[PDB]
Design an enzyme around this catalytic site. Sequence first.
Site, PDB file in Angstrom:
ATOM      1  N   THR A   1       0.718  -1.215  -0.224  1.00 56.09           N
ATOM      2  CA  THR A   1       0.040  -0.221  -0.014  1.00 56.09           C
ATOM      3  C   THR A   1       0.974   1.099  -0.027  1.00 56.09           C
ATOM      4  O   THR A   1       2.041   0.948   0.251  1.00 56.09           O
ATOM      5  CB  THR A   1      -0.878  -0.206   1.485  1.00 56.09           C
ATOM      6  OG1 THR A   1      -1.831  -0.637   1.020  1.00 56.09           O
ATOM      7  CG2 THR A   1      -1.509   1.289   0.838  1.00 56.09           C
TER       8      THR A   1
HETATM    9  C1  LIG Z   1      -2.137  -1.712   2.392  1.00 56.27           C
HETATM   10  O1  LIG Z   1      -1.427  -0.766   3.430  1.00 56.27           O
HETATM   11  C2  LIG Z   1      -2.672  -3.119   2.474  1.00 56.27           C
HETATM   12  C3  LIG Z   1      -4.045  -3.303   1.595  1.00 56.27           C
HETATM   13  O2  LIG Z   1      -3.923  -4.211   1.212  1.00 56.27           O
HETATM   14  C4  LIG Z   1      -5.050  -2.807   2.208  1.00 56.27           C
HETATM   15  C5  LIG Z   1      -6.277  -3.221   1.839  1.00 56.27           C
HETATM   16  C6  LIG Z   1      -7.239  -1.718   1.554  1.00 56.27           C
HETATM   17  C7  LIG Z   1      -7.373  -0.197   1.904  1.00 56.27           C
HETATM   18  C8  LIG Z   1      -6.142  -0.584   3.539  1.00 56.27           C
HETATM   19  C9  LIG Z   1      -5.473  -0.921   2.533  1.00 56.27           C
HETATM   20  N1  LIG Z   1      -2.235  -3.958   3.825  1.00 56.27           N
HETATM   21  C10 LIG Z   1      -1.850  -4.975   3.528  1.00 56.27           C
HETATM   22  O3  LIG Z   1      -1.736  -5.826   4.731  1.00 56.27           O
HETATM   23  C11 LIG Z   1      -1.079  -5.284   2.432  1.00 56.27           C
HETATM   24  C12 LIG Z   1      -0.375  -6.015   2.665  1.00 56.27           C
HETATM   25  C13 LIG Z   1       0.875  -5.535   3.215  1.00 56.27           C
HETATM   26  C14 LIG Z   1      -1.620  -4.176   2.127  1.00 56.27           C
HETATM   27  C15 LIG Z   1      -1.701  -3.900   0.282  1.00 56.27           C
HETATM   28  O4  LIG Z   1      -0.463  -2.811   2.261  1.00 56.27           O
END
Ligand SMILES: *C(=O)[C@]1([C@@H](O)[C@@H]2C=CCCC2)NC(=O)[C@H](CC)[C@]1(C)O
Lengths: 222, 223, 223, 222, 216, 216, 220, 216
Positions: free
Chosen positions: C1
Amino acid sequence: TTIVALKYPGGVVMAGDRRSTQGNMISGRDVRKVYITDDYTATGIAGTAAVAVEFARLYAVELEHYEKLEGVPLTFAGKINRLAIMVRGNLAAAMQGLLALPLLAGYDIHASDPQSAGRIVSFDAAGGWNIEEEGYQAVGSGSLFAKSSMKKLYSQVTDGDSGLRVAVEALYDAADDDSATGGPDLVRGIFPTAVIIDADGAVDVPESRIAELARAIIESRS
Amino acid sequence: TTIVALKYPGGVVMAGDRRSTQGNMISGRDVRKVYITDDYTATGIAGTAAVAVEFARLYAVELEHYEKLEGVPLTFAGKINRLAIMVRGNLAAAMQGLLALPLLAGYDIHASDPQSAGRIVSFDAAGGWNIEEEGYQAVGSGSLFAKSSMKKLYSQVTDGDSGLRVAVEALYDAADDDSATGGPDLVRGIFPTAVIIDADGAVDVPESRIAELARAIIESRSG
Amino acid sequence: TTIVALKYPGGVVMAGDRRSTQGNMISGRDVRKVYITDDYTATGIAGTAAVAVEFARLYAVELEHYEKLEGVPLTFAGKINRLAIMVRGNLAAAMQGLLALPLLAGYDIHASDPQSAGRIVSFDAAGGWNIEEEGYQAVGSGSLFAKSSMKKLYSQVTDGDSGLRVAVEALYDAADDDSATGGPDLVRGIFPTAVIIDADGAVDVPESRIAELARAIIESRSG
Amino acid sequence: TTIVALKYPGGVVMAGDRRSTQGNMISGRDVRKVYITDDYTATGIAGTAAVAVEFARLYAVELEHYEKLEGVPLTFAGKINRLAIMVRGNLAAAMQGLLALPLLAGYDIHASDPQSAGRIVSFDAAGGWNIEEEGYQAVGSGSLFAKSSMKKLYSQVTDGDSGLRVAVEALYDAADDDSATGGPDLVRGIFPTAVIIDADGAVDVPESRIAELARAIIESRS
Amino acid sequence: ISPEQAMRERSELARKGIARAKSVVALAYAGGVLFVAENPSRSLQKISELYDRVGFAAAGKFNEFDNLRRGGIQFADTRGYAYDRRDVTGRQLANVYAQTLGTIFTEQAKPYEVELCVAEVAHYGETKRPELYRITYDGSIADEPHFVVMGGTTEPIANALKESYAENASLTDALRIAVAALRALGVASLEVAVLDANRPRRAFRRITGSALQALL
Amino acid sequence: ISPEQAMRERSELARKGIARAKSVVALAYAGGVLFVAENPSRSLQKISELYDRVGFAAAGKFNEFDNLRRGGIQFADTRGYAYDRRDVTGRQLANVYAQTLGTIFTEQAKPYEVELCVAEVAHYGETKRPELYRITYDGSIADEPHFVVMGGTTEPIANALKESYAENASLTDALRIAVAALRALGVASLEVAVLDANRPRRAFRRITGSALQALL
Amino acid sequence: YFISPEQAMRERSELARKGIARAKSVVALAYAGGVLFVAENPSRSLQKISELYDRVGFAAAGKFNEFDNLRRGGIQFADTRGYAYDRRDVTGRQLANVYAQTLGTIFTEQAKPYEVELCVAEVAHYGETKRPELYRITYDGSIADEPHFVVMGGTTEPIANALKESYAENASLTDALRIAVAALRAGSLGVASLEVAVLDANRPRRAFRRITGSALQALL
Amino acid sequence: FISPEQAMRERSELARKGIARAKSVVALAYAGGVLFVAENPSRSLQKISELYDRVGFAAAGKFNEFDNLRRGGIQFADTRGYAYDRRDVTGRQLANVYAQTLGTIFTEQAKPYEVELCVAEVAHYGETKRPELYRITYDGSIADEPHFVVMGGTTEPIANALKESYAENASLTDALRIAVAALRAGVASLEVAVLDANRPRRAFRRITGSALQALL
Ligand SMILES: *C(=O)[C@]1([C@@H](O)[C@@H]2C=CCCC2)NC(=O)[C@H](CC)[C@]1(C)O
Ligand SMILES: *C(=O)[C@]1([C@@H](O)[C@@H]2C=CCCC2)NC(=O)[C@H](CC)[C@]1(C)O
Ligand SMILES: *C(=O)[C@]1([C@@H](O)[C@@H]2C=CCCC2)NC(=O)[C@H](CC)[C@]1(C)O
Ligand SMILES: *C(=O)[C@]1([C@@H](O)[C@@H]2C=CCCC2)NC(=O)[C@H](CC)[C@]1(C)O
């Protein structure tokens, strides 16, 4: 830390060092560890600073509270019990490292014989108390050194002034062997504090008298 | 982090650095760590940012709350006790890594002698407090370097202006030896903040004044 | 993210990537991470999706709730405080792994100078907040890459459009270096989302504008 | 610590040593561990000093409390039950190292046969009690030594005075083998304390009588 | 008695108590708001700060309005802490007092023999007409544009002001006009304070002793 | 229940019992404040220390004002511990009794048949005029500048004080003036105590037996 | 019916004043050896005189279930106080004070007031010198410090005067007993019909001592 | 404010009426302990019961009400004996507890209990002590009776009838007759039980059917 108390004909004296530390670091040089808790009693506390200060402050308030409510002060035995109960209440925190142990000195106005109305009471972490009858007591990391010193000097105690000198010399011996107890600091002019209690009540000993005794002990050992 | 406080004839000065970090990363360069908490007191806080900020905010509210309810401000001893109780209340959290330690500086309007009415009070995690009697104190990871610096420079503190200059130099020495304390940033123009308190009350020291002192310290050590 | 936010003359822009993952697996390609929370504020959230989403939804309700009850919206400082309290309330859960961190962007209608009324506020797990003074901020696993990219591109920001371009390029650099951040997907036509806020309020940036910027960034680097 | 109790024709005697320690250190030399808890009973306690003292004090209050409320004292069985319940109440604390175990001695005014109305009751940490029928019992770190000593000396008990002698000698044997139990201190003039209870009630045994018995035991062994 | 009688019973009980008490006036002036009350005591006050730009004044039974004063300070400080200082307003305080007195008047054994005035001036360097609210013993609330009078016999004082009230009157002119309409009296017998719109944050300021003298 | 009738009955019920009881006077004098009460008992007291510089005196039903005395000591000790000793004041204690008596008067079956006086003298080496407050059964509070009279028939004692009273009277003169205005009795029928401003911390001091004998 | 507070007050007071008048009488008087308690009591099991603490005694007149309630509460208070502070900190004045406050609350807050009248007495500690203290607490919480004797229950006037005249300070136990029994008798006997006890100054710790059967006989 | 003197009257009458309107019971001391005889035709619903080892219970009045007290008594006794020792339970304690319970009911519950209770105790095995009999009124009054107790219905006739025929240490048969007689003033209509002092532990013993018939 070292706090000592000893009985002399007609009263009692309690004296404490001025050092506070954090691990090996000297973090304070003028802490006051002996408090006049009411007209006839003094409390000295060793261990966690936060707890010790709160003990002395809350205890003085509790003694005077009883006096105002009931019109008369608590008997000496009652005062002992209140302090013991307060210590016992800290047991859980104390097992978590917040441990503080008080030493109580007083003059019992209701005792039959005035020359021996002096009282010294020690306490353990669970609230157990013991009225000391051997003449002196001490608490803190330098207490064993102070007691072994007083064991050899106690026969010299004949009145308030010699009692004060022996107390100061016991604190001197504690500081000499325990790095956590502060010795007289001649550069900054900071010396152990003391309280004397006799039939006329508890009074703070003026610093100048302690400085005088300390200089004499040092001269003597030089 | 380093927050320093020192007494001078007639008052007290408290100054703090501007750095915030996350591990080895510099995450902030303009954080303000010293707050005026009422007309005669300032609070500087080290440790956990979230708890630090909440301490200052609630403390200011609590002091003014008493004043409005009772018609008069708390005595200086009462102010100390309130801050101590607030610190003690965070002890369980502190043991969980949410630890914050404040440093309190103030001017006691009710003290007998005005030249020495300045006050510096330090606190431990359990709510223990101690009114400093040696003239200065510091909290934070650079506090030992700051204190050892003030020990050598304190004799120069003859008034509020030299007190402010020394405070800035103590912070400079803290930053020189502690990577978690921020030094004066000449490129961005960001300098330590400070508060001076005397009989007329607590006032924020203008940034331009601190910048001048900082540039002078820098020039000196350059040769 | 990766969620980024930056101030430009007259406003603020916030943009976020579209990826969601479960371990190494790409589990979503069109998640929206930036929400308009009231007429002048947007919230972007990183971390645990369930908590992140709840935060954004509950926070918007809380802001409007105050407005209807009191007849006027909260001051910007009040909005920050409410978000901080909400994050702080999730601290225990966060320690147990339900960790969510919001990034707040807004335009303060009551600020004295309109050109700089834009606001960016970051939050830590304990509810600590910081009003950003450097011009931009970012949260999420690609935030450091995004910030180092904006550090070099920020001087190109002179208005809302150059602001938006730098935001999309920062997200592109985050995706280029962080496998957990989604880059522009030309095959499916999915791009980062973005919100722009100025004196006229918060508005979603149309996908076609973002698509055009992303394609230009890609083409530009292709040679 | 060692506390002993034994029955003699017409009564019971309970005696305790005077030592308190903190690890290897001797921290007290005049502690009193045997208390008269009502006109016909005595309690001796071993274990954590704070708890032991509270037990003795709270228990005496509870017995007298019942007597004032109901107009008559509790039956001996009732006295035993109340002590047991108090010990049981301390079980959690005991498991955390605050263990205290009492030994109860009494004279049952309502027993059919007066010569054997003496009673000795022991208690375990969970509140279990046992009315001893073998003639003697002891608690504390020196109790096995004391019991083995009384096992050989008990046949000499024919009255209160020989009963008191054997109790003092059992304590002497306990101190001889257990460093945590204090022997007679001839230099300071400190000796074990003792309580004798017969049809006329519980009375403290004067220190001078115990000192004669102790000096007699010492000469005899030299 | 009947619920119809109850209300008049209570209402009367309250009107009597307030009628039998000293009077207070609050009026807008050039520098903000001025509070002047007939008050012999040196320790017991009828005028007080509530929040940054909000002031309080009451007439009636002291123990009752002091109680309300404390409650108001509690409400304001709590609100400011939970949101932001600038989110606390005179209107919110008046609203809260209205609701509280309304509940007391209806649910408490005795209605409160009090009449309150909450005033607010603009924030530093801002421009806005002072606001004055009156809340009565039954929870009724009124938005007054120039001045408020409470306690004792108001009619005389009311009219006296309806006549000498000069908009944008300086502090001295306002003080005089007020002390006058009130007599319709010096430092020993009066309590005076202003919500000084020119103060950076805390507007409440007491005017006493020599300083008050000069103004008299 | 008609609000009117009740407030009237309760009131008389308290006025009655109070006038039925012994009398007490408190007056400012050179050395602080003097408390003199008509009291035959040797054990039951009507005058008491509350805090360092604050004294208490009452008239009326003993069990009721002793209750209040204890409550006051409770309040003061708790305040001083939570803030600092010097933060506890006579004004705060009076204010508290007012709130308490008003609450009793309104919410309890029977109102308290008592009249209280809270007094405060300056802190050691400080200069400030003694303060005297009177708190009534209804919870009314009044700031008295020279003296307070409570219990029994006050009129006679009040006036007697008015002619006699002297600001700065020495202790002996004040004692006499007081014992006199009271008769309007010896050491075996009087309770005497002072808030001695000259005492370093605890100002409260009882004057009894031979010592009292001398003074009178 | 519904009554004014003033009327309800008089009614309660009467309701209790009646109940106390309707009951047997009790007297407590200071004498050379401490304090003497003598009550008209036929019962062998139900008592009106009791020990409270080391040097403190209790006597009551009125409805048994109500003053026995108070007796228990007093013993509870004293034991708790002595344990929380020290035995020597418990005093007759404290007990009287507590009863005053309790009866005051009962009289005001309970549907029915307690039909009782209590006397708390205290004698000096062993080998100490102090004049006995006697306190009377009435059904409404009023408390009075009596210096020589206290009379409660039934028609007191006759018994009161009878003592005002017979009563002598420092009377021996026998003289005090007689003086008391006669006065009491004035109201309206033997060991079967009397409850007698003393707070004995001579005793080292527990002063309270019952005088019954043959022993009581002899004093007569 | 409701009239207290009225209430005591109402309530007391309501209770006296119900008890007056009920079957009668008598308990009397005899050579072998205590004898209980009550006018009862019911096979299943009992008015006489064991409470503890040497303590018995008998009641007159509304069944559901005194049965509640019977169960409560057994509860109190069993709990006491377990917490201390069996020997520590006494008739005096039980009577005392009933006195306190009825007193509270009489004062605090919508309706007072229409009951009259008798608690009796005999000596412990091989011990010597005069039986004890206690009567507890609906109001909670308690009385120590030395020879016999009569409760329920019209007692006067039965009382006197007894005052004449009661014999110190009558045998069981003589006592039964004397009792059944004074009562009239049939096995099916009479309940009978005794606290037999000769029983080693449990003294309560019922005398019914043929066994009961023989003593007549
Ligand atoms: C991002 O922080 C991420 C996202 O999957 C998540 C999904 C929708 C909105 C809030 C953010 N959170 C996680 O745990 C993932 C793994 C490192 C992510 C892709 O970073
Ligand atoms: C002493 O017990 C000591 C003191 O620092 C402390 C300070 C003020 C009053 C209470 C006692 N406490 C400690 O933890 C130190 C380290 C062993 C100390 C110096 O001994
Ligand atoms: C300093 O104590 C420090 C600051 O980040 C923090 C930020 C704002 C005000 C409160 C203090 N706290 C930390 O945890 C850092 C760790 C190295 C810090 C820079 O020392
Ligand atoms: C004995 O049991 C002992 C005593 O210190 C203690 C003190 C006073 C009365 C109760 C008993 N308790 C201990 O923990 C010591 C160490 C083994 C002791 C000396 O045995």
